[PDB]
Amino acid sequence: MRTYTFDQVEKAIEQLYPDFTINTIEISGEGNDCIAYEINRDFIFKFPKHSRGSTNLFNEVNILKRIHNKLPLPIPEVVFTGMPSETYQMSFAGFTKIKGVPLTPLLLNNLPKQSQNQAAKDLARFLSELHSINISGFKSNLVLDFREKINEDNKKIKKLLSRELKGPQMKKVDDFYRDILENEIYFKYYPCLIHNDFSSDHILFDTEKNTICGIIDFGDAAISDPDNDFISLMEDDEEYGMEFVSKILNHYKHKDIPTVLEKYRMKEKYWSFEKIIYGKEYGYMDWYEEGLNEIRSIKI
């Protein structure tokens, strides 16, 4: 893991845009991949923290460029771009900022019912248009393989938790992996471009007009299962309700919602385990302890 100063960031952006004048620079956020810098209150510049991050940055730029004016809600335009360097394919990129505030469950449930129903409509049309884009010109490295994902994750789990779990408890996490790989519903889907991180934090809302005014954070977008963009909208209570997400599903004219829900139940359980890895990686004791408490708990 590396990090950047404000001076490092300004220098990089000047050499490649030596005419561009940086006036105000604050940090807007940080994810697993990238530190976001807000520049001139109008642009978000993202800088990778590692190789994989720089790869995802590159993919995010190529994806956004490619759908630039294609979708029925605003999304970041790529305005500025950096260069390859050692392991880094994209040294940085800069994007338009998007006015609005996250459509949190709280905010959502406090809107009048006609505005909530309009929100379900807008999300559906967005997802539907996104999922329609033809993929036959995307490189193969952007097609996610879920069998391989599962095998990687089962392997990392077994390493982290070797000294934390008794044999019967390890067996039961392995039972989870074993069974999902043996069930074709999770691998037998029509691949399309998906946001791959489609939740409340990344849906921007205009509180004046009481409508949705943006989607952001395409850093994990890929070619994968479109149903994944519906199941991410739900997370017990921490995200939206089934009732809300159903209106999305029906506006989008999805033809097998049971399958969506089966993927939902699976993903809930899957994140029960995956959180433990992120838990150890970032030192987040909620994710690590609660995950480990669920495994040890005999309720299941």
TrEMBL record:
Adenosine binds at residues 96, 98, 217. Guanosine binds at residues 98, 217. InterPro entries: AGP_Transferase, Aminoglycoside_PTrfase, Kinase-like_dom_sf. Transmembrane segments: none annotated. GO terms for molecular function: metal ion binding; nucleotide binding. ADP binds at residues 33-34, 46, 96, 98. Mg(2+) 2 binds at residues 217, 220. Mg(2+) 1 binds at residues 202, 217. The keyword Glycoprotein does not apply. Keywords: Metal-binding, Nucleotide-binding. It comes from the Bacteria. Signal peptide: none annotated. Residues 41-255 form the Aminoglycoside phosphotransferase domain. NCBIfam families: APH_2pp_Ie_IVa (NF000076). This is APH(2'')-Id.
